[model samples]
Target: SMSYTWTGALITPCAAEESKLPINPLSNSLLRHHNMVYATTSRSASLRQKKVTFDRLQVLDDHYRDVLKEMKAKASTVKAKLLSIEEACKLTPPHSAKSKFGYGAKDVRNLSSRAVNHIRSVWEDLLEDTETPIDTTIMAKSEVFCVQPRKPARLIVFPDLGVRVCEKMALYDVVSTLPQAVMGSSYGFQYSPKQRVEFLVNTWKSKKCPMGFSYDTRCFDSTVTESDIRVEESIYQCCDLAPEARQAIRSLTERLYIGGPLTNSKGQNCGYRRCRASGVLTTSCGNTLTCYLKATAACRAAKLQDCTMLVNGDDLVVICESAGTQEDAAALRAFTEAMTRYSAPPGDPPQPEYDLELITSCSSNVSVAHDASGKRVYYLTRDPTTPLARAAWETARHTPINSWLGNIIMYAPTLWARMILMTHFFSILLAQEQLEKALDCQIYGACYSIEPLDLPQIIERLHGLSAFTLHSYSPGEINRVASCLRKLGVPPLRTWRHRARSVRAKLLSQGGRAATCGRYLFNWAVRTKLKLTPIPAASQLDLSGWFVAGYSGGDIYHS
Candidate 1:
């Protein structure tokens, strides 16, 4: 599998109505053949989603009840505070798009009575009218769950100024913490790339000719039933929600959760109504719980051997003992049947794989890369599209954050990351003026404020011996990367490689952050390691509770 996959964002470059008759943004964009990305809806896959799913398809008896009570009781013990308009405003990126209300996202964050007042009214209404549903707006992107299959820049729209703030106030902690409580050791975000690899490898080795396959549910949001969403609401209700939190949840369910409208980029009516809004507070929690319920129950029906799951929203991958090729096919068919019976028909048939590398989930895959030591190493990596998209944005506009910098930090140990990403972006950041700014990003759904110059410290805490100690990428890997670069109409890896070296030399000439950029970003280019300086930022932040634990081996007993 040395064949390269374009890991960049699927920027379906299209004519932006006003564009010279709607031109695609990226000249050589990856979505050129995206019409080809269709799901295999064989006759069986043609089944539509059910309005509700229940115990007959999934075992909701005592096992489900215990986990529910476990989460409920645990939630009751937890305490979270609502964020002030000002405090939340601080988290808003400065350059976020201007609202239809004539104020930009930053204005709402810094100080906006309009934003605050609207939020207050929404919260009050949520408390006041539990029966009435709220109408929600559509959005275009996010970090909470699976990235939707390719289309133009799009995100699920839900809520507004106040509702969004109110959501963070009440549900942020729930989305962050409660999934693990209910799903336990099987929660996906709890493990690092290394740990996840270890778990997969261990699980694979533990079984004889293990059968593994990724699952896809067609339009998952539409599949979520009112009953399912209500099930999630009940779990949160067990928590002592402030009267306001209580109201917000119900109102969202009535208005946004059970579903709302689906408009497009053109603002033309998309004409979809009454299903789970992807952007709602309940979306993530509801999907995870529902998916787990259906999956666990389905595994039992399929008689999967020691079934273990790594699920994220509608996206899922399962590992279990192979029941022989013929038997595995039967197991898959049974799994599909169980899922369909639950009213969550697959977009395509699921196929069992003997190798973990043969599957991709949560936009990540098990792959090999040369780490800092130049040794080929196996770990998980995400599609590079997002960072690359923002990187392209940096070149043409004032990007609110330098995404390339964050990608380099997060994926410092990767061949594609270091050789292509860092070499290109840091060279640009370095050639520019003394830009000592920081931006916040998630390494694994947990926040890390990244500064281009703090590579030494970030790398030390993240992956040490750091960037410079790594070996150059193999030519086979580079050729694929080069093909990607050229196809994207970007410079070849070698061009960026040379520029990265120049930036490293210049960075050393300066001190502090500049020196750091030279040492870490270009450390791969120049063969030198700078003395380690303790980073207060990395040390002060607790890395514990960030990764999902207990899934390293065996069934994680969520039952």
Candidate 2:
């Protein structure tokens, strides 16, 4: 036996002229009627659409349900099979007594090596068939080493005193021997004798008096007369020979190592040395002795004065000794050590420990205050009986399972059809200016509060009544009205029902007609003028100040 039935009834069309329309005490009653009728018809159509949608949705829902049920059944069957296999294994045991052979016939250990190999091969093949390919890019990348230096320079020295040569020698010595200390000791003891210190001296002998102290060969070669010797002493003492020599050495040392300071164009000392030694003796030009002492003095001053010059404490002491001042040496050493320490690379910062007790106490106090004040409070707690309670709670609460499910559910064709019908109905209704104004006025009047009746409180009280009334209507009729209002950007059926109930209650208390009275009058006018029965609930009502006009190149059908 096969039986099928249609789930929806087709809407009956209305018969009405464009101008001849019934009027009621409320202005624009016809427009209200037309709107309600249109809304009702649209809702009916939406319901049929909804039914079709829901049916299709139900089919898909059933398909998924069946799939889940089948999976569950399969799992249960597998579990049963495993249990049975376990029972069979438990029942089966090796024979306690051996056969009439050296070893027990029931013993699996007696199996031949070939047989065992065959069994292993079969098992290997089974495992190979089940193997799945997995992405291993992460592992490959993880294994690659990127050579990045943490500390680029092993050492940084200031004053550039050929200390880099010493460092190179030290490093070479270190790498050459397995143990650096042993190699250093061996080299120091064995290699000292081999090292040579050679001295090459260039002496200048001049006969001229020149401009300064003349190292006159005439005085050194033969005994001078009393007058000549006196003149020699005067010239030599006035030239300040000893001081000039010292200044010359200092200048040479500064030029060799520490950079020369601002002075004369000849890189000579600006003091008495420059004035007296302009043409003294042979006045050997470009002689190292001329600026040796000046270079030494400059180096000493730089080491003492410049912070960057004193980077390495040991080097500062070794190099500054040329100045022949222990006080300067010690001061440079200390200053350099301080600068080095200040400029040293930073170390890892101290780790911070959270004050759990303080935080917990503060949060608990806040929660307690919130509870006492009747405000919302949130807290995380674990059930003592549950295993891994914290993990399970985090997993369940944080996962977006519902949202994912909603996305899947929206793919249903029925849901789309209902949405489209609702959209179309509202698009038409909202186009009429009079109809829109009337609807707005009705909503305003209904929502307006008086004496003891705040809008929010009234709405809240009517919530249950509204829900009940909305549910009382057929789903198709409700959908029609809802769709129209939704297109007009009006609130949903639930909101309108709440407002209607609140307005009805207010009117009842004030001894006015029931809320449905206005609806009934509007409906009667629509029925007589449009010559249609069963006008929609939405179309049969109007607000105080509204009118209807044609929309979408069509005249307004007021019934």
Candidate 3:
């Protein structure tokens, strides 16, 4: 099936660096740092073997029964509504990452009759094909993280649009509440950056003997067994459901979730597996509950001393009283053994560390983000490459989320996030008169419908005044960042400073939230900042769980 082709390196003349992109001095200056982002596409070779498990023999106890009873009761009040084809299309964001369906979100949003009809028919056809396994389009999801010089993307395989609708209709409410009912404060999306920081700091200060480390499951999605998924479904089934809801959940699980063929971008078959799908509505809740169960059971199995855990899907952090050097090693080994027996293997073997600041979970590390009155801001940050790549694409067209804007909101305090990301993107957004437009972005893997205007309040609530007025960094800190830029081949601080000045003036010149952005986002560019005022709505958010003796609860944020 080789489509006849010839291959050779067709060399072209190199243009003078000065002549290349003769505008946006800041963008041209910092282009290399942006280009260094690695977008990976390969999936696990071991997962490609479609191994099937015929039966699940997991024994249950009173604990399992207890949790299931509560969850089912919660589900009694649940209502899963199916979105109309037209309305679902409208919910698709403008310039969302295009799927393999040969239609973009723009087409759907415009209510293109052709696109709507095709989507409608696809849903209709899916309802008929309950007996057959579905074909999924698999790709590497490009995201920003703080690790490698060129980090690869995470692999995600998902079914087509029709199946997505099926997923939304069946699992939406379950995802919204089930995880919180099961896992308290650690229900990833429910917590803010502030709560997570406060917990870590308090727990660290609470005990002088505290020892902890982060554990990562290698290829977490693939390692999930068909049995675990069914158990998850079994829990969902306990919920009182409409006739259509039950059928949709069951049929979709067998056809799509249990196992499906994966097609690469080149349209080649890439085998199949009976495992959890990362790109699905049930992903967050399913993974969190599964990880929690396995980890909780493992703690008992390992005899870990005073085992306290905070789990956000596959990424887990454990804090416990010190078990001495040799004992800690043995305990961790036992913990690893138990998890592996449960089928989730560690990528980087978990280590025991005494320093809370050293613990890295969810790609966020406790680091200094301020000077004189500087509080340690625990905001997740990473290199500014893929963000710029996507930003460049968005600068020309539209994008589902503006990476620069998103980063400015989440990581407004980090040196690279503030100096480079905010400056570069705001400069462009201002020129285009696009400050009024808002976009959705993920913070701590928790999705938010971010309004650019409202960030001052959100940042104030989450990171406090640190996001507003972080003044200076030591030579070692600034040098470290400069080194990353150099290694990534980006311009240094002075260039970003120059760009920030240009951007700062424009944002302040415009009133409304635009001025607020200039004052908070680019405050480092100026001497003084406007008074740090908190948003009223943000203050009421209680992400950290409190024990009121016997008060059992779910979804406290809304109430």
Candidate 4:
């Protein structure tokens, strides 16, 4: 069967969309090549559709069934509860989409009678109607990127607000706790950036010949089959569930999860989907589980020795003992063939890598840098193109979510994130005197309203004092950042250093958290730096569930 069946209706936008970065003095100071930055829109949805729509063929063997059994056994050990209506409502992000019925996210959170009534009705409908296809909104995701091949706007299909709340009540507990219970350390969302690098380093050093490879599946969501989704449902069913929960799961699986009808912004039929919906509650855990199963079985089929797999949704990396150069090359081909037979083909062909840094996973690689003590510190870094592009966008306008803030928090130790992102944004925020104002930034998949003034303590807790004191960087890493800066027409490193010095002085003059930011974050800009110590407030911050899961399209927010 085909991935999608279109009805010849257009996917329309509800509001006017901006593709180019607007000319603003603040944005121009950060990036001169405004023309190079653009955001994807509904105009490119057809192009993306062609790329993702295709026929799928899958054949399961004993190896796959064996892995599935193993996974099911672990899943059987779990007991997931149905979330209360209030508990699920609390998980909704403040800015979540309003229901077609009149209630909004705020009403849901406060358990208003109107919202509660609609939610209960939706749950009752889920129980009674087992075969009716659910309706989902299809829209092109507006994401910032530098000029390349003009990536098509990714399609996001999501159900109504009432159904979403019901979904949370039924499956939120299962998704939050199941993947970790089943996959353990192989589950990639459980680790912090610092801890992830440590795992990569340790896994690399543990191998005899240290052969590694990162697999890229072509549009993983589109590759999911009806059988694949059914298998996922069976795995979920293995857990002990309430009678109502079981019925609801079965109903959602048949009516909504496996496939759904797509409606555009104008309330017209756009298409129908037979593959996994990217916006569903099960997306993160389902993709992780399915991808892990296929890769694990493929590893066995290829006879890769002592394979250690790290999977985050569809992003996969394997570290294993190498037999020899000739054998390793042939084994990767065998692995690829096995994955292809399982319907998960690669976007880029896999190649065996001896150097750990060359094998990029989750778009990040492990790199070595020096701290104030000149001790080697391993941190995660990635190409700065997309991040710098988004930073330019935020500089020009007021975006609902500040991605640069999130990048700064996640990639604090990276050269580009620190020198350019921190210096440029801090200078702007300080000038506007909004340093203490809270801004929303997502970590993992959950959104948090964060204060810029608290970054000193946040960075200290997440990346340690070394993040603020890091200096000498790897030559390869530096070149990547320098090249990106040049391509983006961003100011040179020297210019940023000058700006950082000025920003640092202004922050220090404020005499509290701002001073702490000046003392810690801009240490690299000054010749004589203050002694770095762990901030007392760092220990008091509640960081629970910060790195636990990925909820990109899950519509989750921390209150």
Best by TM-score: 4
Candidate 3: TM-score? 0.76
Clashes of 2: 29
Tens-digit lDDT track of model 1 for 247-299: 66777666667655544434544344454565554565677767877777778
Instruction: Give the residue spans of candidate 1 off by over 4 A.
Output: 1-115, 139-155, 192-195, 205-209, 261-272, 369-377, 382-390, 439-449, 466-468, 472-482, 527-559
lDDT of 2 by residue, 1-559 (tens): 0011222332222232122122332212112222222111221333332221211000112322333333233222211011111121121113212222233313323343442343344323323432221100000000101122211111100111111111111121111121112111211111111110000000001211111010111111011122222222222222212332323223322221111111222222321111111111111111111111112233333354321111100111111122234544455444333222212111121111122111111011001112222443222111111111111221123321122111111111122112221122222322332112221101100111121112112212212112111113234434544554444333454443343333333333433222232232112112222221232333333322111100110000111
Per-candidate TM-scores read: 0.75, 0.12, 0.76, 0.99
lDDT of 4 at 3: 90
Clashing pairs in 3: 40-153
| Ten-residue stretch with the least lDDT total in model 1 | 550-559
Report the lDDT tens digits of candidate 4 across residue range 259-378.
Answer: 989999999999899999988888888899999999999999999998999999989999999999999999999999999999999999989999998989998999999998899999
Cα RMSDs, all models:
8.9, 46.8, 8.0, 1.0
Better model by TM-score: candidate 2 vs candidate 4: 4
TM-score of 4: 0.99
lDDT for model 4? 0.91
Error of 3 at 300 (Å): 1.4
Per-candidate Cα lDDT values, in order, are 0.58, 0.21, 0.61, 0.91
Worst 10 residues of 4 by lDDT: 550-559
